[PDB]
Amino acid sequence: GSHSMRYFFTSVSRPGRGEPRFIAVGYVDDTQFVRFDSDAASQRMEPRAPWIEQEGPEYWDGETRKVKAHSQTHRVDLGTLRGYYNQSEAGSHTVQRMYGCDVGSDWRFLRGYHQYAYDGKDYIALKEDLRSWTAADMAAQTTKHKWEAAHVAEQLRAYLEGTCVEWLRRYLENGKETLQRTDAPKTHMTHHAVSDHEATLRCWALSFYPAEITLTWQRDGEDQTQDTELVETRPAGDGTFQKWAAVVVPSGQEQRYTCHVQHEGLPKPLTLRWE
Amino acid sequence: ILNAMIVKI
Amino acid sequence: MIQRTPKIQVYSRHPAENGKSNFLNCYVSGFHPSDIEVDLLKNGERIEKVEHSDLSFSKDWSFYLLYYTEFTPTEKDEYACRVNHVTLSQPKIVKWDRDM
Ligand SMILES: [Mg+2]
Ligand SMILES: [Mg+2]
């Protein structure tokens, strides 16, 4: 199928407590493969998947140099943004950055992205054409103008269309056992009385990969949203994911409801019924 | 791998 | 500035059976800002040997973390996750519901 490589960076100012926190993590699809944490002992980019551990010392030396460069830019950015919004030195603020590339089933470039956020909301993003920028407010228009005048997008587009795709293909090959896999959900349903008039039906999906899944409830075939409770898809901790969805139903009408499971590991979608 | 150029705001 | 309150789920890695070793998970997601305290509790007392994932975030910029510890469930031991965050007036304790 299609695949992605994404890097996630979080920078948090610590007023009166010294240097900002900086955390970088890299993913291929839903699998993490590297990390850097400013507060950890190594001060190096570190492996977090078996298939990246085989990269040699030039890899780890270069990624450590580059992730430190990312850290240094984010440290200056916090001060710049505090100025742009005329904020006091007393409060903590957050910068987040995400960039990466998608490839299709042919492993050819599909799309690239680079998004930046300040205090939890969009600040500036690269447009889908990878040639100019979308500013979220008037302060970010200052950055848009500066980055467009300086042609910043050109080097980034070359990275997203080139380097990013080439190294994603390398990782997919080297980690094929882990990354080129689908684990279909293991499914079941539980029943619990709520009162002498109502019962909870809970549809479960366990041990699946990748994380994308859809659980939906129907009554007599009609989509059901009245009472549907859905939890966020969650990690099991072994490389797979879990999710459930529940409906509260009148006692004795259980057989009218069906739970429908869609996942790329399933040849056909599943339908579960309390019976 | 990471991008090698990271321009400041 | 935006604040987002954490969503908290407490659950085992594998279907739980008394006497079989397993992992106990506390998944905290959808929160902002990133400062958060998460403890796993055994009969009300914090568990020391707890690991956690590297901070990352979702498409809406909200953060998520997994805290986890190796454990062997029993009939009598009660587990919980305690979370503190700026959006919480008091620390929030979510019990591990073994019957879902
Ligand atoms: Mg140019
Ligand atoms: Mg997401």
Residue numbers in the entry:
A (entry chain A): 1 to 275
B (entry chain C): 1 to 9
C (entry chain B): 1 to 100
From the paper:
As we intended to emphasize structural differences emerging from amino acid mutations, we further narrowed our database by pairing each peptide/HLA-A2 complex with at least one other in which the peptide differed by only a single amino acid, either as a substitution or transposition. The utility of these models is found when comparing results for mutant peptides and their wild-type counterparts, as the models can indicate the types of structural alterations that impact TCR recognition of a mutated vs. wild-type peptide/MHC complex.
